[PDB]
Scaffold this motif. Structure first.
Motif, PDB file in Angstrom:
ATOM      1  N   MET A 250     -38.665  12.878 -35.498  1.00 14.02           N
ATOM      2  CA  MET A 250     -38.779  13.268 -34.092  1.00 14.02           C
ATOM      3  C   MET A 250     -40.050  14.079 -33.889  1.00 14.02           C
ATOM      4  N   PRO A 251     -41.105  13.491 -33.335  1.00 16.53           N
ATOM      5  CA  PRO A 251     -42.366  14.221 -33.169  1.00 16.53           C
ATOM      6  C   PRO A 251     -42.230  15.305 -32.117  1.00 16.53           C
ATOM      7  N   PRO A 252     -42.482  16.566 -32.480  1.00 19.05           N
ATOM      8  CA  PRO A 252     -42.347  17.662 -31.515  1.00 19.05           C
ATOM      9  C   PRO A 252     -43.614  18.015 -30.753  1.00 19.05           C
ATOM     10  N   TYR A 253     -44.768  17.476 -31.140  1.00 17.07           N
ATOM     11  CA  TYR A 253     -46.018  17.829 -30.488  1.00 17.07           C
ATOM     12  C   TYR A 253     -46.536  16.670 -29.643  1.00 17.07           C
ATOM     13  N   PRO A 254     -47.235  16.959 -28.546  1.00 17.76           N
ATOM     14  CA  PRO A 254     -47.787  15.878 -27.723  1.00 17.76           C
ATOM     15  C   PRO A 254     -48.909  15.147 -28.443  1.00 17.76           C
ATOM     16  N   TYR A 255     -48.943  13.826 -28.256  1.00 18.75           N
ATOM     17  CA  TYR A 255     -49.981  12.966 -28.831  1.00 18.75           C
ATOM     18  C   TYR A 255     -50.054  13.112 -30.350  1.00 18.75           C
ATOM     19  N   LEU A 256     -48.892  13.241 -30.988  1.00 19.97           N
ATOM     20  CA  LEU A 256     -48.805  13.327 -32.441  1.00 19.97           C
ATOM     21  C   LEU A 256     -48.307  12.040 -33.081  1.00 19.97           C
ATOM     22  N   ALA A 257     -47.378  11.339 -32.427  1.00 19.01           N
ATOM     23  CA  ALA A 257     -46.854  10.096 -32.984  1.00 19.01           C
ATOM     24  C   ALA A 257     -47.926   9.016 -33.043  1.00 19.01           C
ATOM     25  N   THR A 258     -48.815   8.978 -32.052  1.00 23.63           N
ATOM     26  CA  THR A 258     -49.849   7.954 -31.986  1.00 23.63           C
ATOM     27  C   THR A 258     -51.041   8.251 -32.886  1.00 23.63           C
ATOM     28  N   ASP A 259     -51.077   9.416 -33.528  1.00 24.99           N
ATOM     29  CA  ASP A 259     -52.111   9.748 -34.506  1.00 24.99           C
ATOM     30  C   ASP A 259     -51.482   9.592 -35.886  1.00 24.99           C
TER      31      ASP A 259
ATOM     32  N   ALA B  66     -44.097   3.540 -26.494  1.00 24.98           N
ATOM     33  CA  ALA B  66     -45.497   3.391 -26.863  1.00 24.98           C
ATOM     34  C   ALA B  66     -46.354   4.177 -25.883  1.00 24.98           C
ATOM     35  N   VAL B  67     -47.414   4.799 -26.393  1.00 25.43           N
ATOM     36  CA  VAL B  67     -48.297   5.643 -25.595  1.00 25.43           C
ATOM     37  C   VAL B  67     -49.723   5.136 -25.749  1.00 25.43           C
ATOM     38  N   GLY B  68     -50.356   4.809 -24.627  1.00 27.74           N
ATOM     39  CA  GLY B  68     -51.758   4.417 -24.631  1.00 27.74           C
ATOM     40  C   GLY B  68     -52.059   3.154 -25.407  1.00 27.74           C
ATOM     41  N   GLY B  69     -51.191   2.150 -25.306  1.00 30.60           N
ATOM     42  CA  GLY B  69     -51.406   0.890 -25.983  1.00 30.60           C
ATOM     43  C   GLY B  69     -51.072   0.885 -27.457  1.00 30.60           C
ATOM     44  N   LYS B  70     -50.578   1.994 -27.999  1.00 28.70           N
ATOM     45  CA  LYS B  70     -50.197   2.094 -29.400  1.00 28.70           C
ATOM     46  C   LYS B  70     -48.726   2.465 -29.498  1.00 28.70           C
ATOM     47  N   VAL B  71     -48.034   1.862 -30.463  1.00 30.93           N
ATOM     48  CA  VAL B  71     -46.604   2.090 -30.617  1.00 30.93           C
ATOM     49  C   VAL B  71     -46.362   3.516 -31.091  1.00 30.93           C
ATOM     50  N   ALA B  72     -45.440   4.209 -30.425  1.00 33.65           N
ATOM     51  CA  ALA B  72     -45.046   5.548 -30.842  1.00 33.65           C
ATOM     52  C   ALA B  72     -43.798   5.520 -31.718  1.00 33.65           C
ATOM     53  N   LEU B  73     -42.721   4.904 -31.233  1.00 26.95           N
ATOM     54  CA  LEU B  73     -41.488   4.840 -32.006  1.00 26.95           C
ATOM     55  C   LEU B  73     -40.646   3.654 -31.555  1.00 26.95           C
ATOM     56  N   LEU B  74     -39.901   3.099 -32.508  1.00 28.99           N
ATOM     57  CA  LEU B  74     -38.974   2.001 -32.273  1.00 28.99           C
ATOM     58  C   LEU B  74     -37.918   2.028 -33.372  1.00 28.99           C
ATOM     59  N   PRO B  75     -36.745   1.435 -33.134  1.00 29.52           N
ATOM     60  CA  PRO B  75     -35.681   1.472 -34.148  1.00 29.52           C
ATOM     61  C   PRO B  75     -36.103   0.811 -35.454  1.00 29.52           C
ATOM     62  N   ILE B  76     -35.659   1.394 -36.560  1.00 27.75           N
ATOM     63  CA  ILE B  76     -36.058   0.973 -37.900  1.00 27.75           C
ATOM     64  C   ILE B  76     -34.933   0.133 -38.496  1.00 27.75           C
ATOM     65  N   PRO B  77     -35.181  -1.121 -38.860  1.00 24.45           N
ATOM     66  CA  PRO B  77     -34.139  -1.934 -39.493  1.00 24.45           C
ATOM     67  C   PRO B  77     -33.930  -1.554 -40.953  1.00 24.45           C
TER      68      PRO B  77
ATOM     69  N   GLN C 255     -46.058   1.443 -42.157  1.00 18.59           N
ATOM     70  CA  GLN C 255     -47.122   0.521 -41.773  1.00 18.59           C
ATOM     71  C   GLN C 255     -46.581  -0.862 -41.437  1.00 18.59           C
ATOM     72  N   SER C 256     -45.494  -1.282 -42.083  1.00 15.22           N
ATOM     73  CA  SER C 256     -45.011  -2.646 -41.918  1.00 15.22           C
ATOM     74  C   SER C 256     -44.073  -2.823 -40.729  1.00 15.22           C
ATOM     75  N   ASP C 257     -43.198  -1.854 -40.454  1.00 19.28           N
ATOM     76  CA  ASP C 257     -42.112  -2.078 -39.509  1.00 19.28           C
ATOM     77  C   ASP C 257     -42.189  -1.246 -38.236  1.00 19.28           C
ATOM     78  N   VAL C 258     -43.043  -0.226 -38.173  1.00 16.76           N
ATOM     79  CA  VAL C 258     -43.045   0.665 -37.016  1.00 16.76           C
ATOM     80  C   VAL C 258     -44.404   0.669 -36.327  1.00 16.76           C
ATOM     81  N   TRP C 259     -45.441   1.088 -37.046  1.00 21.68           N
ATOM     82  CA  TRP C 259     -46.755   1.256 -36.443  1.00 21.68           C
ATOM     83  C   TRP C 259     -47.352  -0.088 -36.041  1.00 21.68           C
ATOM     84  N   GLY C 260     -48.194  -0.057 -35.015  1.00 27.06           N
ATOM     85  CA  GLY C 260     -48.842  -1.266 -34.545  1.00 27.06           C
ATOM     86  C   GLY C 260     -49.467  -1.047 -33.177  1.00 27.06           C
TER      87      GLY C 260
END
Ligand code: CLA
Ligand code: CLA
Ligand code: CLA
Ligand code: CLA
Ligand code: CLA
Ligand code: CLA
Ligand code: CLA
Ligand code: CLA
Ligand SMILES: CC1=C(/C=C/C(C)=C/C=C/C(C)=C/C=C/C=C(C)/C=C/C=C(C)/C=C/C2=C(C)CCCC2(C)C)C(C)(C)CCC1
Ligand SMILES: CC1=C(/C=C/C(C)=C/C=C/C(C)=C/C=C/C=C(C)/C=C/C=C(C)/C=C/C2=C(C)CCCC2(C)C)C(C)(C)CCC1
Ligand SMILES: CC1=C(C/C=C(\C)CCC[C@H](C)CCC[C@H](C)CCCC(C)C)C(=O)c2ccccc2C1=O
Lengths: 742, 80, 48, 152, 42
Positions: A363-372, A506-517, A605-610
């Motif tokens: 759970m990212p607690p800071y703004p613009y942290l998940a997309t970095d 997703a924030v700014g065209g980049k995925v922030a978070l999605l469910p993990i299989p 890298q494989s299942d979340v980020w993109g």
């Protein structure tokens, strides 16, 4: 009773003790006969328990060392703030956080290293940082550099104050032994005062400063047009326009109709769509609740008055089915020696650090942290390594206590004796568990490799041929996904997006978070993690339990804690001390942490980020090859080590070239470590003899006769070099990949 | 059983006898030293090979020497 | 957030990027000041 | 000229490499504003690269087929400055350091406990000893002739 | 003053001072003369 007790001028400040090295130990203070003396002078510097026997001096030295450490930490924080203030592009990054990379270091132009000043963005050239300080500053409400300069000055002042306090409490007024042995008052002050009050003040700051500035920033207002933080306090009209509840003042709080504060104290949960982080109102609410809880819990122990609880009474009056009389003499043991407390605190801190890393990535607690992505990867790996090191050190200090501070005559405990009376069964069961877990976990991978190498893809343990699914984890995920509907009516959405079920953020065209299989690969990697953890636990427990004596050596406690061996007899008795057990468990901790970080990196890298296009399709960095390539060792070697190392080896001539150089240098150090792990002292001594003869022929013989390193020193050097090389290699590879591709 | 030998450079400081963990060495009267005594190793069969006697011996080279030899249950330090 | 500060930002959108770029350039040049020519050996006394 | 090598001013690959470096620098230079400090730094870098290439061409080195300079350690009189002169300078400096160290060791050997002098250096004696290394070859030659260099 | 001077003459302090001076001199020499591959004075 509770009182302040001090001694006036126990020691006199002078430079006479600086001139003579090794004044703490008489053997060291006598003088250098050979070179080994030097190697000893640094080994026994911080062993206060061996310098003397009185507890008072040890406690005073510990207090002064704590003050010095605090001063050093404050200096480091002040330096970081000053670098952020002066050499950085914080103001440019504030306006466009998505398209600008943070940077806070500038390299000189002496040799040709100016190629290291990359084009981070915002009209600036420098090294891109991954400390995550910019997000912290944005979440705190800082919108200028004068505030950062003031913070740096305050940090410098506080560091000076801490140093002066340390000097004053060692050389002017030193507390007595009875002051340190008062654990009830210390616990009350640490719970109610240090934790509750600090969190309450931070919640007040967030309510008064962070929330309005962050709301203005999220609205779209230019950072140079936002009113200064003290304007919100001075002007109640501005706050009334922002949050109407403030128009009522503090009357609702005393009126118990707290619902009026529902505007800036919410319980929604989830991630903020604009910034891809947690809501600041939820954070302030959580801090307020935590402050209340700590303030309430800080009044439990009896100090100086009738009301309260006694720790000794609680321990002694404990009765249970399996325990019995149990904890009778534990209070004296815990209040007598420092090593037991050190071990307990080290283990707790390591576990807390690991939990912190997990909760922070989830759970990212800071703004613009998940997309970095680089910041997330660096934080996760760093916190995992720190936690592992602390957990390792806890066992070493436990063994030190068991060796040198345990006597069953004056201070006897029933539970410790009961545990020490059946250690063989514990060790045997742990050994069997480790063997079974390792056999199954690695045999699955070896079977998969062999079946795939023989043209039999239908016989493997995979999602298509033979399925081993984590049913319990999937059930927990479904329960968590369905939690806010019926089980937690207060929350609007679930705590995290990791749980299977919900929407994508997703924030700014980049995925922030999605469910993990979760599939077969997660099953296998989790079992491997369990196997490694069990082996490390087995090593450390065997080291701790058999420290005093063993069937092979019945008097191991007389030799001490740091001895190489007992001799060539009995078939061989090399590495029988607990120090050798810790030195052996360091390797397994390194292995486990490396496996964990590799798993985390590849899965993320494989299942979340993109990235996401305008149509609505999501393209991941590696295109979801984890579920089919991570079931064999060849897949791990080819699709992870070979494929993702393209960026680091091709970074020459660019701004990332430094990383590539490190990717080589660490390797060298690793190989160097082998020289200290495969050889012995006699060969080196015999070579130094001939070298010394060659020196003697030319009248350049030193008075301090050169000597080869001791066995323990060689083992320590080898393990240190091994760990440093491996960690630096992983650091360089991770940073190069995540900066070049993300 | 290992082999323990004593040479005539001994000065009878009795450190080796005290260092032994299995009561192998003892002291006997002698004639060619100030201390008028010398060490001996009668109970050779109880030696384990820890080489503590060599660790505690002041001389240019040790006056007590231990050579490893055929091993048995006693010299291997086995309790099972 | 009251759309008056948004209108102020829209009105003063220009020169704000200019100020940001000037600050970034000064931050970068703080390391290359000597190589540029200014802040040479004279006037380093209580300077830069 | 020597071993099928081409003088570095004549070779074309040298100029090609210079062109590639200048183009690579200008590619990044084009991004920033003309008045910005990064533009000045990149212009200084370009000037430094041009000066370095001009000096390398002037000094008469021999680039190979790949276009990079090569060093000749034969002893040919045309290439004495590549190896031989820096070698002589290094030998002089190393002899100075070794002579100073040996002299200090011999000077402090007289005292009762030289180990405390080794772990805690004395500054006046070392300062007196240090400047005697300027004439180390003569002293070493004379000591070798007398027979005080080698212990007996 | 005697004890402070004695401490300042210990091995690590003298070593760090000497190496800092040497590094500064080398850096300044390389700054004044940017690149050098052969000895051109002769
Ligand atoms: C370490 C774990 C491991 C495991 C579990 C497996 C498992 C499997 N392998 Mg693989 N394999 C492995 C490693 C492993 N392999 C390694 C290291 C290699 C060498 C590279 C291979 C090479 C290999 C080959 C060449 C082949 C397989 C195949 C198979 C299957 C054959 C099973 C069988 O016929 O005998 C099972 C026999 C038994 C007697 C079972 C004993 C276990 C029982 C159930 C004990 C349970 C204990 C119980 C709880 C006790 C409680 C007591 C209480 C009641 C009181 C099976 C799925 C075969 C295949 O084709 O499959 C598709 C095949 O041809 N394997
Ligand atoms: C946490 C520790 C810390 C660290 C690692 C650094 C690291 C750095 N500092 Mg910072 N700094 C710190 C705290 C720290 N600083 C504090 C507390 C202050 C306030 C006084 C400063 C103020 C500061 C200034 C004013 C400058 C640096 C600069 C530098 C860099 C060059 C230093 C140098 O070459 O000195 C040479 C060594 C000796 C004199 C001996 C280096 C990256 C320099 C820079 O980056 O220039 C481009 C520079 O100009 N620092
Ligand atoms: C409510 C007041 C109070 C507060 C705030 C603290 C706070 C602290 N104590 Mg505890 N302590 C207290 C009461 C208090 N104590 C009492 C009554 C006793 C005697 C039983 C102790 C015994 C004690 C010991 C023996 C030790 C500590 C240590 C620490 C520090 C832990 C380091 C850390 O976690 O980083 C948190 C960092 C910060 C918040 C730094 C902020 C600086 C604080 C606010 C300084 C002011 C604190 C002081 C109590 C008030 C000044 C009184 C004086 C001016 C007259 C931290 C500064 C450990 C330490 O690190 O030693 C230096 C340590 O070794 N404490
Ligand atoms: C932790 C420390 C803390 C501090 C120092 C303050 C300080 C203050 N509060 Mg804040 N506040 C806090 C936490 C804190 N608050 C929390 C946790 C909440 C959530 C309930 C609020 C919610 C709040 C409201 C609703 C109001 C204030 C007000 C005030 C200001 C008026 C001064 C006064 O009445 O005495 C405060 C106490 C001391 C200085 C002692 C003052 C700046 C008033 C205001 O708006 O003034 C600008 C007011 O109406 N505060
Ligand atoms: C929380 C703080 C903490 C504290 C206060 C102590 C305190 C103590 N430890 Mg414990 N310990 C800890 C955590 C801690 N430990 C952890 C996490 C571990 C696991 C590694 C250990 C493992 C451990 C061992 C194995 C031993 C102790 C012992 C000791 C005592 C001697 C200290 C010493 O002389 O070092 C003085 C300092 C040094 C010798 C410096 C060594 C150089 C380090 C290893 C290099 C690190 C390099 C750097 C990170 C990389 C950059 C390279 C660059 C410099 C070029 C001292 C009472 C020793 C003892 O004798 O106890 C009775 C002992 O043998 N500790
Ligand atoms: C990669 C090489 C390697 C391997 C495979 C091992 C293996 C092992 N280590 Mg060692 N170790 C290593 C390097 C290695 N170590 C290093 C570098 C160090 C640092 C000094 C150590 C230090 C160390 C310590 C300190 C400890 C171990 C222990 C163990 C055992 C763990 C229990 C278990 O998992 O067994 C299960 C078996 C395996 C994982 C091995 C592979 C077997 C595969 C599946 C093949 C089986 C196929 C089949 C049966 C073969 C038949 C063919 C034949 C008929 C022709 C196991 C034997 C622990 C121990 O012994 O406690 C139990 C322990 O405490 N190791
Ligand atoms: C099994 C474990 C479990 C757990 C860990 C929780 C946890 C929680 N519950 Mg849920 N809940 C559960 C089962 C559980 N519930 C069941 C079986 C029911 C049916 C009776 C509910 C019905 C329920 C209600 C009616 C409320 C909560 C609330 C809460 C939250 C605040 C707790 C608090 O009151 O202090 C917390 C997230 C409170 C809430 O949602 O506030 C945010 C609340 O009002 N829960
Ligand atoms: C170790 C010896 C040393 C020596 C001999 C020099 C020598 C010199 N310095 Mg350097 N310098 C050094 C260390 C040294 N510096 C250190 C440690 C720093 C960091 C504070 C600097 C920073 C520095 C600056 C900022 C300047 C010089 C300048 C100069 C020149 C002045 C004439 C001369 C080339 C001056 C110069 O002439 O620049 C044009 C100049 O302005 N030096
Ligand atoms: C960042 C940083 C910094 C800073 C800091 C700060 C700035 C702080 C502040 C702080 C603060 C500023 C705090 C405060 C606090 C407060 C408090 C703690 C309060 C309390 C209160 C109370 C407790 C109350 C009570 C009551 C009640 C309940 C009712 C009525 C009555 C009365 C009022 C009494 C420095 C530089 C240092 C360092 C680096 C980092
Ligand atoms: C984890 C970590 C970290 C961090 C940390 C932090 C961040 C901390 C914080 C802390 C804090 C944040 C603290 C706080 C504190 C506070 C306090 C201590 C307070 C006090 C108060 C008082 C004392 C008050 C009083 C009063 C008044 C004034 C009014 C009313 C009345 C009374 C009396 C109540 C780092 C990075 C370093 C690294 C390592 C680890
Ligand atoms: C290489 C090696 C050595 C030899 C290592 C040595 C002698 C360490 C040498 C350290 C330094 C390089 C010696 C000199 C230190 C002084 C500070 C030098 C001062 C002079 C200038 C450099 C300032 C052992 O003694 C040894 C012992 C037991 C197991 C393995 C090994 C082992 O692998």
């Amino acid at each position: 009773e509770v009182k302040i007790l001090v001694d006036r001028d126990p020691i006199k400040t002078s430079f006479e003790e600086w001139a003579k090295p090794g004044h703490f130990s008489r053997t060291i203070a006598k003088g250098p006969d050979t070179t080994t003396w030097i190697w000893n002078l640094h080994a026994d510097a911080h062993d206060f328990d061996s310098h003397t026997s009185d507890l008072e001096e040890i406690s005073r030295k510990v207090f002064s060392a704590h003050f010095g450490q605090l001063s050093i930490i404050f200096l480091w924080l002040s330096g970081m703030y000053f670098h952020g203030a002066r050499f950085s592009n914080y103001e440019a990054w504030l306006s466009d956080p998505t398209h600008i990379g943070p940077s806070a270091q500038v390299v000189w132009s002496i040799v040709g290293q100016e190629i290291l000043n990359g084009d981070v963005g915002g009209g600036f050239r420098g090294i891109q940082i991954t400390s995550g300080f910019f997000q912290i500053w944005r979440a705190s409400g800082i919108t200028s550099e004068l505030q950062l300069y003031c913070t740096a000055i305050g940090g410098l002042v506080f560091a000076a104050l801490m140093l002066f306090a340390g000097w004053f409490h060692y050389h002017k007024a030193a507390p007595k032994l009875a002051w340190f042995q008062d654990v009830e008052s210390m616990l009350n002050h640490h719970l109610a005062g240090l934790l509750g009050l600090g969190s309450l003040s931070w919640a007040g700051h967030q309510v008064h400063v962070s929330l309005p500035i962050n709301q203005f920033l999220n609205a779209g207002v230019d950072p140079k047009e936002i009113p200064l933080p003290h304007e919100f306090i001075l002007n109640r009209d501005l706050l009334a326009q922002l949050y109407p509840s403030f128009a009522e003042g503090a009357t609702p709080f005393f009126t118990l109709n707290w619902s009026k504060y529902a505007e800036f104290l919410t319980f929604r949960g989830g991630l903020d769509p604009v910034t891809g982080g947690l809501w600041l109102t939820d954070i302030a609410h959580h801090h307020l609740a935590i402050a209340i809880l700590f303030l309430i819990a800080g009044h439990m122990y009896r100090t100086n008055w009738g009301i309260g609880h006694g720790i000794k009474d609680i321990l002694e009056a404990h009765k249970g089915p399996f325990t019995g009389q149990g904890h009778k003499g534990l209070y004296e043991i815990l209040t007598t020696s420092w090593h037991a407390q050190l071990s307990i605190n080290l283990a707790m801190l390591g576990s807390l650090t690991i939990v912190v890393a997990h909760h922070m990535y989830s759970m990212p607690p800071y703004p613009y942290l998940a997309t970095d992505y680089g910041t997330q990867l660096s934080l996760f790996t760093h916190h995992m390594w720190i936690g592992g090191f602390l957990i390792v050190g806890a066992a070493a200090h436990a063994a030190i206590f068991m060796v040198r501070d345990y006597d069953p005559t004056t201070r006897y405990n029933d539970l410790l004796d009961r545990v020490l009376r059946h250690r063989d069964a514990i060790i045997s069961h742990l050994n069997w568990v480790c063997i079974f877990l390792g056999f199954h976990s690695f045999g699955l991978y070896i079977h998969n490799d062999t079946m795939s190498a023989l043209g039999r893809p239908q016989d493997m343990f995979s999602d298509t041929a033979i399925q081993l699914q984590p049913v319990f984890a999937q059930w927990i995920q479904n329960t968590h996904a369905l939690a806010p509907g019926t089980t937690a009516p207060g929350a609007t959405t679930s705590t995290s997006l990791t749980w299977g079920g919900g929407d994508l953020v997703a924030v700014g065209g980049k995925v922030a978070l999605l469910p993990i299989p979760l599939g077969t690969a997660d099953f296998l990697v989790h079992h491997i993690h369990a196997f490694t953890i069990h082996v490390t636990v087995l090593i450390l427990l065997k080291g701790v339990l058999f420290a005093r004596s063993s069937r092979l050596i019945p008097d191991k406690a007389n030799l001490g804690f740091r001895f190489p061996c007992d001799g060539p007899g009995r078939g061989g008795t090399c590495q029988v001390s607990a120090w050798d057990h810790v030195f052996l468990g360091l390797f397994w901790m390194y292995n486990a942490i490396s496996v964990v970080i590799f798993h985390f990196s590849w899965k993320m890298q494989s299942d979340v980020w993109g990235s996401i296009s305008d149509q609505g399709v999501v393209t991941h960095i590696t295109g979801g090859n984890f579920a089919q390539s991570s079931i064999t060792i060849n897949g791990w070697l080819r699709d992870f080590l070979w494929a993702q190392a393209s960026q680091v080896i091709q970074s020459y001539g660019s701004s990332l070239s430094a990383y590539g150089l490190f990717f080589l240098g660490a390797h060298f150090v690793w190989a160097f470590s082998l020289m200290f792990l495969f050889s012995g002292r006699g060969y080196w001594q015999e070579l130094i003899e001939s070298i010394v003869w060659a020196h003697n022929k030319l009248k350049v013989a030193p008075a301090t006769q050169p000597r080869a390193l001791s066995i323990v020193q060689g083992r320590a050097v080898g393990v240190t070099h091994y760990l440093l090389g491996g960690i630096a290699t992983t650091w360089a590879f991770f940073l190069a990949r995540i900066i070049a591709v993300g | 059983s290992h082999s323990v030998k004593i040479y005539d450079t001994c000065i009878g400081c009795t450190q080796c006898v005290r260092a032994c963990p299995t009561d192998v060495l003892e002291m006997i009267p002698w004639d060619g030293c100030k201390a008028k005594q010398i060490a001996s190793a009668p109970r050779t069969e109880d030696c384990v090979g820890c080489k503590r006697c060599e660790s505690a011996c002041p001389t240019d080279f040790l006056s007590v020497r231990v050579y490893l030899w055929h091993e048995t249950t006693r010299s291997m330090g086995l309790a099972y | 957030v009251i759309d008056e500060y948004l209108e102020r930002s829209k009105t003063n959108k220009e020169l704000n990027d200019k100020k940001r770029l000037a600050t970034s350039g000064a931050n970068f040049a703080r390391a290359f000041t000597v190589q540029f020519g200014s802040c040479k050996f004279p006037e380093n006394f209580t300077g830069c | 000229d020597i071993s099928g090598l081409t003088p570095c001013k004549d070779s074309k690959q040298f100029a090609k490499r210079e062109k590639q470096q200048i183009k690579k620098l200008e590619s990044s230079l084009k991004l920033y504003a003309p008045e910005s400090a990064p533009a000045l730094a990149l212009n200084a870098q370009i000037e430094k690269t041009k000066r370095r290439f001009d000096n390398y061409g002037k000094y008469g080195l021999l680039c190979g087929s790949d276009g990079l300079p090569h060093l000749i350690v034969n002893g040919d009189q045309r290439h004495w400055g590549e190896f031989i002169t820096p070698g002589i300078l290094f030998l002089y400096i190393a002899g100075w350091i070794g002579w100073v160290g040996r002299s200090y060791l011999i000077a402090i050997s007289g005292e009762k406990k030289p180990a405390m002098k080794e772990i805690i250096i004395d500054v006046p004696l070392a300062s007196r000893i240090i400047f005697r290394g300027f004439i180390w070859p003569v002293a070493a030659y004379r000591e070798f002739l007398n027979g005080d260099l080698i212990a007996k | 003053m005697r004890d402070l001077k004695t401490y300042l003459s210990v091995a690590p302090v003298i070593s760090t001072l000497w190496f800092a001076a040497l590094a500064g001199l080398l850096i300044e020499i390389n700054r004044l003369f940017p690149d050098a591959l052969i000895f051109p004075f002769f």
